[PDB]
Amino acid sequence: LKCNKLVPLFYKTCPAGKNLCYKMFMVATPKVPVKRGCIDVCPKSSLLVKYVCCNTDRCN
Questions:
Q1: Boundaries of domain holding 10
Q2: Quick one: which of 5, 36, 45, 52 has the most CB atoms within 10 Å?
Q3: The domain spanning residue 22 has which CATH number?
Q4: Which residues touch 44 (CB under 8 Å, ≥6 apart)?
C-alpha cells in the first residue's frame, strides 16, 4: 500500500493495514498542503488543522 508523495511525481509507502493516504494542511490553504503520506485513521480537523485521508492506493 503506497500513497501520493507531497510532490505530484512520486509517492510514499504505507505499512500493512494503512491504505488511507493522508494530506495535512491549514484550512486557509486548500490546494497547497504541506505534507501527504499514509494513515490508517485520519485525525480530527479543527479551526486551523485539516488532515485529508482516503482509503485507496495513492489517493492524497
A1: 1-60
A2: 36
A3: 2.10.60.10
A4: none
- When divided into structural domains, the chain yields a total of 1
Cα 33 from Cα 36, distance rounded (Å):
8
- Which residues, 6+ apart, have CB-to-CB distance to 18 below 8 Å? 1, 38, 39, 40
- Cα 53 from Cα 8, distance rounded (Å): 16
CA–CA gap between residue 29 and residue 35 (Å, rounded): 12
Method underlying the structure: NMR
Grid coordinates belonging to 15: 505499512
Residue 8 in grid coordinates:
505530484
* CA angle, residues 48, 53, 11, in degrees to nearest 5: 110
